[PDB]
Design an enzyme around this catalytic site. Structure first.
Site, PDB file in Angstrom:
ATOM      1  N   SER A  94       3.883   1.943   8.501  1.00 27.89           N
ATOM      2  CA  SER A  94       3.328   0.947   7.581  1.00 27.89           C
ATOM      3  C   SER A  94       4.632   0.681   6.668  1.00 27.89           C
ATOM      4  O   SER A  94       5.554   1.135   6.426  1.00 27.89           O
ATOM      5  CB  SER A  94       2.659   1.643   6.414  1.00 27.89           C
ATOM      6  N   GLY A  95       4.775  -0.825   6.730  1.00 25.62           N
ATOM      7  CA  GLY A  95       5.747  -1.308   5.652  1.00 25.62           C
ATOM      8  C   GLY A  95       6.786  -1.755   6.821  1.00 25.62           C
ATOM      9  O   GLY A  95       7.692  -2.602   6.262  1.00 25.62           O
ATOM     10  N   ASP A 103      -6.157  -3.035  -3.014  1.00 22.98           N
ATOM     11  CA  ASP A 103      -5.919  -1.789  -2.412  1.00 22.98           C
ATOM     12  C   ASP A 103      -7.203  -1.416  -1.731  1.00 22.98           C
ATOM     13  O   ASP A 103      -7.227  -0.364  -1.040  1.00 22.98           O
ATOM     14  CB  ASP A 103      -5.680  -0.752  -3.536  1.00 22.98           C
ATOM     15  N   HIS A 120       0.746  -1.368  -0.043  1.00 25.87           N
ATOM     16  CA  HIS A 120       0.118  -0.147  -0.038  1.00 25.87           C
ATOM     17  C   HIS A 120       0.832   1.268   0.141  1.00 25.87           C
ATOM     18  O   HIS A 120       0.166   2.413  -0.216  1.00 25.87           O
ATOM     19  CB  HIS A 120      -1.059  -0.020   1.151  1.00 25.87           C
TER      20      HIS A 120
HETATM   21  N1  LIG Z   1      -3.546   1.358  13.933  1.00 31.54           N
HETATM   22  C1  LIG Z   1      -2.266   0.948  13.212  1.00 31.54           C
HETATM   23  N2  LIG Z   1      -1.795  -0.158  13.471  1.00 31.54           N
HETATM   24  C2  LIG Z   1      -2.329   1.448  11.848  1.00 31.54           C
HETATM   25  C3  LIG Z   1      -1.143   0.879  10.981  1.00 31.54           C
HETATM   26  C4  LIG Z   1      -0.874   1.585   9.737  1.00 31.54           C
HETATM   27  C5  LIG Z   1      -1.658   2.503   9.338  1.00 31.54           C
HETATM   28  O1  LIG Z   1      -1.359   3.059   8.087  1.00 31.54           O
HETATM   29  C6  LIG Z   1      -2.520   3.215   7.117  1.00 31.54           C
HETATM   30  C7  LIG Z   1      -3.497   2.500   7.162  1.00 31.54           C
HETATM   31  C8  LIG Z   1      -4.357   2.732   6.204  1.00 31.54           C
HETATM   32  C9  LIG Z   1      -5.540   1.999   6.345  1.00 31.54           C
HETATM   33  O2  LIG Z   1      -6.075   1.048   5.259  1.00 31.54           O
HETATM   34  N3  LIG Z   1      -6.368   2.408   7.271  1.00 31.54           N
HETATM   35  C10 LIG Z   1      -7.754   1.461   7.412  1.00 31.54           C
HETATM   36  C11 LIG Z   1      -7.955   0.389   6.539  1.00 31.54           C
HETATM   37  C12 LIG Z   1      -9.565  -0.016   6.718  1.00 31.54           C
HETATM   38  C13 LIG Z   1     -10.350   0.925   5.981  1.00 31.54           C
HETATM   39  N4  LIG Z   1     -11.717   0.292   6.266  1.00 31.54           N
HETATM   40  C14 LIG Z   1     -10.165   2.157   7.061  1.00 31.54           C
HETATM   41  C15 LIG Z   1      -8.877   2.674   6.975  1.00 31.54           C
HETATM   42  C16 LIG Z   1      -4.122   3.526   5.075  1.00 31.54           C
HETATM   43  C17 LIG Z   1      -3.094   4.309   5.056  1.00 31.54           C
HETATM   44  O3  LIG Z   1      -2.767   5.347   4.087  1.00 31.54           O
HETATM   45  C18 LIG Z   1      -1.989   5.288   3.466  1.00 31.54           C
HETATM   46  C19 LIG Z   1      -0.560   6.114   3.482  1.00 31.54           C
HETATM   47  C20 LIG Z   1       0.257   6.031   2.688  1.00 31.54           C
HETATM   48  C21 LIG Z   1       0.231   5.271   1.503  1.00 31.54           C
HETATM   49  C22 LIG Z   1       1.389   5.323   0.454  1.00 31.54           C
HETATM   50  N5  LIG Z   1       2.677   5.768   0.766  1.00 31.54           N
HETATM   51  N6  LIG Z   1       1.302   5.089  -0.746  1.00 31.54           N
HETATM   52  C23 LIG Z   1      -0.818   4.584   1.219  1.00 31.54           C
HETATM   53  C24 LIG Z   1      -1.828   4.515   2.181  1.00 31.54           C
HETATM   54  N7  LIG Z   1      -2.065   3.987   6.174  1.00 31.54           N
HETATM   55  C25 LIG Z   1      -2.505   3.148  10.133  1.00 31.54           C
HETATM   56  C26 LIG Z   1      -2.951   2.527  11.202  1.00 31.54           C
END
Ligand SMILES: N=C(N)c1ccc(Oc2cc(C(=O)N[C@H]3CC[C@H](N)CC3)cc(Oc3ccc(C(=N)N)cc3)n2)cc1
Length: 241
Positions: free
Chosen positions: A191-192, A91, A42
């Site tokens: 993330s990652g 995605d 992602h």
């Molecule tokens: N609490 C945790 N443990 C946690 C871990 C990682 C995180 O980073 C994220 C998560 C998500 C993400 O998918 N969040 C939820 C998924 C379920 C959906 N119904 C609601 C949103 C998107 C998301 O957005 C991005 C950010 C950056 C990119 C990129 N570099 N391309 C892509 C997505 N980031 C958030 C929380």
């Protein structure tokens, strides 16, 4: 990382920072060999204003401790030659959220740069086991990223419990790790990165990849991670590792 503490310098020599050109730190990764990193799919999706899927738009920093000191002794800067996202990555659901990143030049192993061990396909990280999450992500939901690498101790949660906490969202590639009471969790920017698990003789194995969560550190909303054993063969097939 929410509810974490500053890592010691060099405490997680497999932890890598991925910078997108002109944007600073975006995601974590883990070093698995001189030439390969594991990360989350992602992180590498294009959006209308930036081609995150293009390997040439990235820089990996190995041996990094403080985001404001990226040229400190021991930090290694590398470009990427290729990003291999899992073919089944979705995605929308985030199923199969894993990618392999090929370094353009090999990492040089040192006290600050060392690969994490990969678990065999048959290995089970048991419910209840303490494991560590690390990263430069937000230290509070909607908060700000950490300059100094953070670490937090979290525990593997039973899969049935996980599925019930996040209905219609948890696939068998995913694992919940954290606490039902909240408090410690990964967050945006983590993330990652790798989940680090201390195994029988103290060596550290990668248990998973930081993937997503509903908010951060909230009660009944532990973070969701991509499992690693399931991908051991895929990693071997695509990297030789
Ligand atoms: N609490 C945790 N443990 C946690 C871990 C990682 C995180 O980073 C994220 C998560 C998500 C993400 O998918 N969040 C939820 C998924 C379920 C959906 N119904 C609601 C949103 C998107 C998301 O957005 C991005 C950010 C950056 C990119 C990129 N570099 N391309 C892509 C997505 N980031 C958030 C929380």
């Amino acid at each position: 990382v929410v509810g974490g503490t500053d890592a010691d310098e060099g405490e997680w020599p497999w932890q890598v920072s991925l910078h997108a050109l002109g944007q600073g730190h975006i995601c974590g990764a883990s070093l698995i060999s001189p030439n390969w990193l594991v990360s989350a799919a992602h992180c590498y999706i294009d959006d209308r204003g930036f081609r995150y899927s293009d390997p040439t738009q990235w820089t990996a920093f190995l041996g990094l401790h403080d985001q404001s000191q990226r040229s400190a002794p021991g930090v290694q800067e590398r470009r990427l030659k290729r990003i291999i996202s899992h073919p089944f990555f979705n995605d929308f659901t985030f199923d199969y959220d894993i990618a392999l990143l090929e370094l353009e030049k090999p990492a040089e192993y040192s006290s600050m740069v060392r690969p994490i061990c990969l678990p065999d396909a048959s290995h089970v990280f048991p419910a209840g086991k303490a494991i560590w999450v690390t990263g430069w992500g937000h230290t509070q939901y909607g908060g700000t990223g950490a300059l100094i690498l953070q670490k937090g101790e979290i525990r593997v949660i039973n899969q049935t419990t996980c599925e019930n906490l996040l209905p219609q969202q948890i696939t068998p590639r995913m694992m919940c790790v954290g606490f039902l009471s909240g408090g410690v969790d990964s967050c945006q920017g983590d993330s990652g990165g790798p989940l680090s698990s201390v195994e029988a003789d103290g060596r550290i194995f990668q248990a998973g990849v930081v993937s997503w969560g509903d908010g951060c550190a909230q009660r009944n909303k532990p973070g969701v991670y991509t499992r690693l054993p399931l991908f051991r063969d895929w990693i071997k097939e695509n990297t030789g590792v």
